[PDB]
Design a protein around this ligand. Sequence first.
Ligand SMILES: [Ce+3]
Ligand SMILES: [Ce+3]
Length: 76
Amino acid sequence: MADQLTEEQIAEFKEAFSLFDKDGDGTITTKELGTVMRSLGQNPTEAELQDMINEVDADGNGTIDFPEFLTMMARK
Ligand SMILES: [Ce+3]
Ligand SMILES: [Ce+3]
């Protein structure tokens, strides 16, 4: 019906995570990360990304989730 800050807000962020998540599986790997970058005009190696993914992923699953990525947004 409408939107709203707080939790509701996140609902929106969902889409954000999608941008990066080109798998729609619910996770953001490296490639998927080195993809959207094309929009910004970037394209780091699988090494850098890994570090970037290991900058939010405190679980060390190797990939990035929605809640693990949400933090990335909070940053900047
Ligand atoms: Ce994915
Ligand atoms: Ce993770």
